[model samples]
Target: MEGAVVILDAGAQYGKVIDRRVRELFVQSEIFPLETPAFAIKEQGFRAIIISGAPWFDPAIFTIGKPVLGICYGMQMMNKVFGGTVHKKSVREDGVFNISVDNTCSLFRGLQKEEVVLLTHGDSVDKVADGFKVVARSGNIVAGIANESKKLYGAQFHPEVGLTENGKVILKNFLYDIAGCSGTFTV
Candidate 1:
């Protein structure tokens, strides 16, 4: 309820972790369920919106408007919602993995071309959502993406998880760098 906060639910269990990482970086952070009413969401005056990975996947159903970072299911939904393609992986990924900056963006500030991140997704997005660009990837995997114009971000990895060496840093970059939000603020 202060400077530039993020909202999440059961989809991404790492919401609270994200909050901590943000605060650690000297920025303020908060977490809430997506079920929160639109009025409530708008009332918070959030700096950005991040849709966490869901227990299930049904992009056709979830339709919330904001700068959302659809983690796993959320990412899939974006593709489904905006005319993209996805396929179930023969082998699911649910642990640590190495990632490389396929390209550079503000979100990857202070990050190098080859960086390792914690992964927790099986489904890989073959096609990106409308106007979205894939800037990062894992071993033959589509890792992270963003809609620069819209300020939406999606990552196959979980920056909140400790498995990734610099998970917190990656997320912080998004919160402060990409979101252009102040890391420190009074509640």
Candidate 2:
């Protein structure tokens, strides 16, 4: 795919759903297994990389300097790699819930003060990485984080699910507002 965004899978079942969502927005997206290398995708001309709620995945992608957003486990992994920590919660936040969002970060831009999204992760970042700021939260749990200066972000919820009222808006901001994509590739 030319002029595309890359979805690096880290064991998320909804990878295909995310692919189609990007396609639905008229942008090309391709999925690769977790731990996929950065060079080929970079050579393929990726505009941004969004890891779909991975159990784990890593690499030189971050050093490449393109924008990156991790959903659930994806974010957890990013946080851990960058001097943060993830802890298993006794009770998983596994349902549709309203969250407080700080739209000061571009990812939550245009969202209401409190937005409804699906939060299904049992594990979350207990300590945020340096340079990362908590942008959204669900009852004190970290729902989202962003290091805008480095063009990196992470969401602890499943925005691909229909349960998320304005989930598409989150993806939109990442693709266009933050990642600077122009939607050249189509479904």
Candidate 3:
């Protein structure tokens, strides 16, 4: 798939759902196993990377310089690798919730001040890594983080699912605006 965005799977069941969401936006995407070498992405001509949510992730994969969007467990892994705190929360969330966006980040570009997203993770991030800023919040938990300089962003929710409000828009903003991807690829 030309101009494809790679989805690095962490063994999540919803990995294909994410691929479908990207396809719905008229972009091409493919899923690779979590432990796939970071260098392989460059050979594939992928424009951006989406780390699918799962229980485990490989820190080495993040060394790639491409723009990345980490989801759920993907977000947790990124936080932990960058010296942030990620732990099992006493209060797990697996439902729809509202998040207050910090418009300073491009991930929330054109999004409302408050938007609903689907979260199904038991782990939570307590602190973000250095140079990474918290961009969205759900109650007391950190819902989103991003490092604009690194072209990396993360969300503690399932934005690829239909349950998330305006989820497609968020993804479109990442691919087209933030990641500088062209929508020339089609299914």
* Each prediction's TM-score versus the true structure: 0.79, 0.91, 0.91
Maximum-lDDT candidate: 2
lDDT tens digits by residue: candidate 2, 1-187: 5568898765536478788778878887888876777887778888899886523455577768889988887788778778899878733547888889997789999998899988874887898999999999866588899998899999988777678999899999999899888866434
What is candidate 1's lDDT per residue for 16-47, written digit by digit as tens?
A: 76666666777655676555555565577766
lDDT of 3 at 160: 87
Candidate lDDT values, in order: 0.66, 0.82, 0.81
lDDT (Cα) of model 3: 0.81
The residue pairs in collision within model 1 are: 11-53, 26-183, 27-183, 27-184, 28-183
Ranking by TM-score: 2, 3, 1
Number of clashing residue pairs, candidate 2: 1
Q: How does model 1 score by TM-score?
A: 0.79
